[PDB]
Structures are given as C-alpha cells and as structure tokens.
C-alpha cells in the first residue's frame with residue numbers, strides 16, 4: 001500500500017484556489033467567448049456548409 | 051322466383067359491402083394510427099395498407115355501380131358508362147389482385163428456404179423482386195384493357211347484354227395471378243412441413259408455428275375457388291340476370307379476404323381483440 | 335501487519351475525505367444560480383452517413399473538423415468527408431469486434447482495436463493507393479476498450495486487463511504501463527496539453543495519470559456502477575464520466591471532488607458516450623434508450639435532445655471548431671447534428 | 673468542380689468504394705455469427721475441432737489473444753464462430769458486442785461435477801442478460817461418454833449435491849439411444865431439465881433453448897448448429913412478417 005499512500009500524500013500537497021474564484025473565472029471566460037460560439041448565438045445565413 | 055332471388059342477392063351484396071368496408075377501413079386505420087404514433091411500420095404493414103386502400107376503392111366503385119343501376123337506371127343502360135365503369139373496374143381490380151400476389155410473393159421469399167440458387171437470389175433480392183413484379187405486370191393490365199375495349203366495341207358495332215364473354219375474359223385474366231399465388235402457398239406449405247419433419251427427427255421436441263394461421267387461408271382459397279368454378283358454369287349454363295350476380299360475385303374476394311388477413315396477421319389479430327375488449331369495457 | 339496496513343489505509347482515506355469536505359464551501363449550482371439558462375437547444379440532422387453494414391461502435395473526428403472515422407462490428411473502418419457526405423476510405427479490419435478507433439491529430443494515421451486485444455495502426459499517407467497496417471501493437475491482456483494518439487509516434491490505450499499503457503508506434507514497445515483500477519477500463523481522454531489522461535473503469539472509479547511520470551495523481555469513486563464513458567473539459571481542469579447509473583458527474587482536478595451531478599428521474603437507462611461542446615457550457619451524452627440528451631454542464635438540466643436513431647447511440651463527438659456533432663448508433667447510421 | 677469529382681481520389685472514387693460495400697453487405701448477411709460460451713472444464717476447445725472441416729489451419733489462441741474467430745460451413749451456408757479468448761470474468765462488459773449474434777452456443781461438461789451448479793448459475797446469468805433477451809441459446813451437454821462411464825460404474829454422486837434427483841424421474845419426452853441404462857438416461861435428462869427449468873421460467877417466446885447431448889468425438893455438432901439456426905432464422909422471418 002506504499003504506492004497508494006505516496007499518491008495520496010502527493011495529491012494532498014497541492015495549492016487549491018477558492019471555488020468562487022474558479023466560478024468567476026469560468027463565467028468570465030464564457031462571457032468573453034459568448035459571441036464567438038456558433039451554437040449559443042445562431043449566425044444569420046453564415047453556415048457556409050450546414 | 052325472380053323477386054326472391056333478387057332480394058337475397060341484394061341482401062348478400064349489402065352485407066358483403068359493409069363487412070368489406072369495415073374490415074379494410076380497420077386495417078388502414080390501425081396501420082395509419084401505428085404510423086402516426088411512432089411504431090416504425092414493417093414492409094408487410096405497408097403492403098397490407100396499400101391492399102386495404104385498393105380494396106376500399108374497389109368496393110366503393112362496385113357499390114356506386116350498384117347505386118347507379120338502382121337509382122335512375124337509364125344512365126346505367128348507356129354504352130358510355132358500360133365502357134368507362136368496366137375500364138376503371140378492371141384497372142383497379144388488376145392492381146389490387148397483383149398487389150395481393152406481391153404480398154404472397156413477399157411471404158414466400160421472406161419466410162421459406164430452398165437449396166436452389168435461383169431461389170436464394172430471389173430470397174435476398176426480395177424487396178426489388180416484388181416491386182419489379184408489380185411494375186412488370188402492367189403489360190397484363192394494358193393487354194386486358196385493349197382486349198376488353200375491342201371486344202365491347204365489336205359487340206356495340208354488331209348491336210348497331212353480351213356480358214357472357216366479357217365475364218369469361220375477366221375470369222381468365224383473374225385466374226392467372228391466382229394460380230401463381232396458389233402454387234406459391236402450396237410450395238411454402240411443402241417447405242414448412244419438410245422443415246418440421248426434419249426438425250422432429252434429429253432435434254428433440256423441447257427445441258415454425260405459422261401453420262396455426264394456414265387454416266384460415268386454406269378455408270379462404272377453398273371458398274373463393276368454388277365460387278369462381280360456379281361462376282364460369284353460370285356464365286353460359288342458365289338464366290340471364292347476370293348483372294346482379296356478377297356485381298355480387300366480384301366483391302367477395304376484397305370483402306372477405308381482408309378478414310382472413312386480420313386473423314392471419316399477429317398485429318391485426320391483437321388490434322381486433324383490443325377493439326373487442328374496449329367495446330366490452332365501454333359497456334357499463 | 336495486514337491489520338496495521340488496513341488501519342493506515344482507512345486513516346488516509348478519512349483524511350482525504352475530511353480535506354475534500356473542508357475544501358467544499360459553496361456548491362457550483364448555488365454559485366451559478368444567477369446566470370441565465372441556455373434555453374432549449376434544437377438540433378437538426380444536417381447529414382446522414384449510410385454504408386456501414388452493422389452496429390457502429392466508435393467514431394472520431396479528424397482535426398480539420400471535416401474528415402471523420404467510424405468503426406462497426408462488421409469490421410469496416412470508414413473515413414467520411416462530412417461536408418460532402420462521401421467515403422474517402424473504407425479500411426477493412428483484421429478483427430470484426432472493433433470496440434474503438436482514433437484519428438491522428440495530423441491525419442496521417444488511424445488506430446482501432448477491440449476483442450482481439452491488438453491495437454492496429456493504419457497509415458493513410460502512403461505511396462501506394464491502398465491503406466496498410468503501419469504497426470500492430472500487442473501486449474495488452476483482455477479487450478482494447480479505448481485508444482488515442484498523443485502524436486504521430488505515441489499512442490495511449492486502455493483495456494480489460496484493468497491497465498492503461500503508452501505505446502511507442504515506431505518501436506512497438508510499451509513506454510509506460512498505468513495500473514491501479516480493479517475493474518476493466520472502458521474509456522480515455524487526453525488533457526489538451528497532452529500531458530495527462532483520465533480513465534474510468536468497471537469498479538466505478540476514475541483515475542488521473544501523469545504521462546511523463548507513469549503514476550496516479552487523483553482518484554474518484556463518485557459513481558456506484560461501472561463507468562463506460564469519460565471526456566475532458568476544454569479547459570482541461572475537469573472531466574465528466576458516464577455510467578450505467580443514468581448519472582453524469584463533473585469532477586474538478588484542482589478541487590479533487592465532485593462539483594455537480596446530471597441526472598433525471600425519467601432516465602432509467604445507462605450512458606454509452608459523453609462529450610463537451612467547444613465552450614464547455616453544453617454537454618452531450620448518448621443513452622441506451624435510443625437517443626442522445628444534451629445538457630447544460632454549468633446547470634444540471636436536459637436542455638435538448640438529438641433523436642432519430644432506431645437503436646442505441648453507441649458513440650458521439652463534437653468537431654474541434656464546434657461546427658458539428660456526430661452520433662453513431664447500433665442502427666448503422668451516423669447523423670450530423672448542427 | 674474538377675478537384676471534387678475526379679476518378680482517382682475524389683467523389684467518383686468515393687462512388688467506387690460503394691461497389692465494395694454493396695459486395696460486402698452480401699457476405700455479412702449470408703454468414704451466421706455464433707458466440708461460444710461455457711466453463712473452463714467444458715470441452716468447447718474440442719468442439720471447435722469437430723466444427724472444422726477446413727484443410728488449412730486457423731489461428732486461434734496465441735499468447736494474450738482475445739478472441740478465437742473460427743470458420744466452418746454446412747450445405748454451403750457459412751458460419752463464423754467466436755470463442756472469447758484471453759478476457760477477464762467481468763463478462764457483463766464484453767457480452768454487449770454479441771447483441772447481434774444468430775445464437776449463443778453454451779457448452780457444459782455434463783459429467784456429474786459439483787461445478788455443474790456454477791454452469792447452472794452462468795446459464796441463469798446469460799439466459800436473462802439484458803443484451804441477450806432476443807438471442808437464442810443452443811445448449812451442449814458435452815462429455816456424456818464420461819457421464820455414461822461414471823453412472824454405469826456406479827461412482828456417480830448426483831443426489832449427494834443435487835438433492836432432488838432421487839425424487840425426479842425420467843420424462844415421456846425422453847428418447848434414449850439403443851442400450852442406454854435407466855440410470856444414465858435419468859441422469860442425462862435430469863441435467864437437461866435443470867437447464868430447461870431456467871430457460872422456460874423467463875423464455876416467453878423472444879428466445880428459445882436448444883438442448884443437445886454430445887461427446888468428445890461426435891461428427892454431428894455441425895449439423896446440430898445448422899438445424900438449430902434454421903429453426904431460429906425461420907422464427908425470426910415469421911416475426912419480421914408479423915405472422916407469428
């Protein structure tokens with residue numbers, strides 16, 4: 001069980017950011033790329049192949 | 051003696067009309083309902099609904115002919131109607147009979163097995179075989195139309211009815227697909243019996259149930275063959291009131307064969323039982 | 335000594351659980367309760383690809399977002415031009431029982447494998463006009479369940495032996511073998527930096543693997559049944575799993591714990607396949623009920639359906655530019671949804 | 673569009689591919705696929721030799737190889753047969769691939785083992801598996817040469833761990849071979865009925881069990897599989913017609 005405990009110790013020693021910060025970063029990324037998404041904002045007659 | 055015979059013929063024709071109408075309408079309606087509510091339909095279902103449509107067309111045409119012969123018969127006596135109505139009838143009846151023959155071919159190919167390579171090729175090309183059979187048979191329809199038209203034209207020219215020979219021609223051109231269907235059904239019965247004989251010897255009974263339905267089709271074949279045999283004899287043997295006799299006789303197959311499809315096919319049998327039980331339930 | 339080892343393992347597990355609970359302060363749904371929902375996604379079958387003789391079992395996109403490979407239990411590995419909807423190659427497999435296939439990022443090679451335990455490499459760019467097996471990889475025990483190229487020379491695989499392994503295509507010898515699952519491993523996905531992969535297994539666990547190290551970094555056991563499907567989030571810091579329990583769970587590697595669960599009371603069937611769209615807001619999953627449910631990743635809700643297959647949707651995937659979804663099914667068709 | 677329509681690598685070549693798929697649809701339809709199943713002590717590795725009338729050798733088990741595709745034919749009908757090879761005892765996973773097959777063949781050492789109860793637990797797992805609900809099982813009670821020797825010698829122990837053999841008696845279904853002993857016939861039919869007691873309990877007409885008795889050397893296994901797929905296929909065609 002040496003490998004399991006070593007892996008657990010390695011995983012424990014890691015810097016974790018706040019969950020709120022991660023959610024804010026995800027929201028900011030979505031807002032930045034919100035217009036660039038084809039599915040989220042349908043393009044008018046710009047579907048060249050589809 | 052004429053009046054009682056005429057009344058009996060009219061009553062039997064009325065019951066044939068209503069029974070055929072309700073049966074074909076039930077088949078078409080259940081197929082359409084199962085199509086609308088998902089339930090991906092099979093090829094047999096498509097053939098059955100097309101056959102039901104053809105049969106309802108034929109029964110409506112025959113009943114309209116009877117109504118015209120009853121109400122204001124002067125129109126029925128006209129030669130123009132004599133030609134047009136018989137032409138449309140022969141077209142519709144040819145299509146319906148050959149669609150039934152295509153259904154029979156579809157069953158013979160899809161279910162049976164033989165060692166003859168030609169049979170295997172037709173077996174694995176079944177879907178194109180039936181469509182080509184339906185399309186290639188149009189030559190028979192055109193020849194029948196030409197023959198009936200020339201015969202009626204010659205009869206009219208000689209006159210200026212002679213149905214004893216037009217009915218003979220119709221019977222001759224109706225036996226052609228019926229003989230093929232008869233031969234195919236007998237070949238499938240031989241195949242199923244050989245299959246079960248071979249299965250009962252080597253494989254134990256604990257291990258081809260379609261023979262449960264074969265009794266309703268043998269009953270149909272026997273009934274309609276006897277009627278058709280009587281038809282040719284009656285066409286020349288005696289009497290002359292053939293209009294009503296022919297009008298009732300020609301409606302037997304599309305009026306009764308549909309009920310044989312209903313009891314023979316699992317989907318239609320279950321639908322009929324569901325209808326019966328729903329009628330029972332709503333009674334309260 | 336066994337009792338002491340068991341006690342130490344239990345203490346370590348309790349400490350890990352306590353740390354995960356302490357790291358939990360606000361749920362994702364509560365934090366994302368203010369953002370508006372995506373609404374009802376409606377998709378239409380822009381193309382249908384017809385020609386596989388049997389059950390399609392895997393498919394993959396080329397990096398051009400236009401070539402597509404798909405595998406079927408007839409043993410055909412067809413390549414399609416998606417846009418024109420026609421067959422660029424129809425590679426005949428040596429094994430009928432193909433459970434996986436992959437497209438090389440450069441489009442030079444395709445891999446496939448299954449119950450033969452052999453991961454075959456097919457080269458598309460050859461002097462001759464017929465495709466040939468560049469390399470056959472052997473050494474795995476039990477079926478090959480998923481495979482993915484890291485480059486033109488490195489390919490990673492998972493299998494019935496509960497292992498994953500990294501293979502050097504040129505030499506044909508395993509470079510590293512990754513073991514720790516008790517159950518058969520069913521699927522892979524490679525992080526976008528091509529430095530880690532994640533795999534899910536029949537013991538209901540998922541594990542993260544450091545490819546340059548050969549060791550497991552994190553382990554997750556959220557599911558209560560065998561995991562079929564796994565995929566990486568576009569950001570690469572999270573992954574979603576698909577199990578027979580009719581539930582999908584999103585795990586954050588940094589948080590090392592579950593964040594949100596996607597499940598509906600009307601679903602009583604397992605999940606075959608899962609992938610994200612390019613932004614990661616829209617999650618797509620194939621189910622045994624004969625249709626694919628779309629979901630919002632950031633808000634658990636079955637926000638759309640791809641329905642039209644006569645049978646089980648076995649596989650699906652989104653193009654690298656987001657401008658199509660493909661789904662394959664046990665009715666031998668691929669439908670392109672957009 | 674000359675770059676899209678050319679005959680060498682463009683859409684006219686991509687039409688010439690469909691000639692091969694049209695030629696290959698045909699062999700995939702024509703050949704029957706048969707998953708082979710059972711215990712470690714089963715003799716199915718002998719049965720595949722009885723299946724093979726091919727003069728050329730066939731590659732089966734070879735190191736870690738995962739499936740032993742095997743080929744034979746009866747009356748010009750081709751059979752592809754698949755003993756699942758080097759795989760783990762997690763069978764609920766690899767069994768999904770076989771939802772397509774014409775039949776399973778399940779092979780048991782019918783030879784008075786305590787382990788016969790594991791073969792009954794496996795047949796109960798396989799017969800009821802959610803992926804196999806439409807798939808018929810052909811059942812081989814194999815090595816009944818050994819069953820005959822053990823029972824004739826009086827060293828059979830079947831009641832001692834199947835505690836209903838003494839209560840069970842030979843059914844009127846029983847058609848034994850000329851000269852078979854009453855104990856041998858009662859024993860083979862009891863083992864047969866113990867499988868049928870699983871198969872009839874949920875075999876509601878989706879799928880059928882075809883029990884057979886077979887030995888290390890009989891030549892009739894190829895025929896038994898041909899006869900039994902012919903019954904399975906005719907049942908499938910009647911259902912495809914909605915005629916059953």
Ligand SMILES: Cc1cc(C(F)(F)F)nc(Nc2ccccc2-c2nnn[nH]2)n1
Nearest residue numbers: 154157158234235238260263264314915
């Ligand atoms: C609905 C049904 C069921 C059965 C079954 F009992 F075998 F399942 N058999 C038939 N008959 C035929 C069989 C073979 C060829 C042609 C016909 C034929 N000829 N005319 N109508 N059907 N039909």
Ligand SMILES: Cc1cc(C(F)(F)F)nc(Nc2ccccc2-c2nnn[nH]2)n1
Nearest residue numbers: 112115132135136139217220296297300
């Ligand atoms: C009901 C009806 C009316 C007419 C009519 F137009 F003649 F009134 N025809 C027909 N078709 C037939 C069908 C079978 C046998 C014979 C004729 C036949 N009868 N007269 N000519 N042909 N059926």
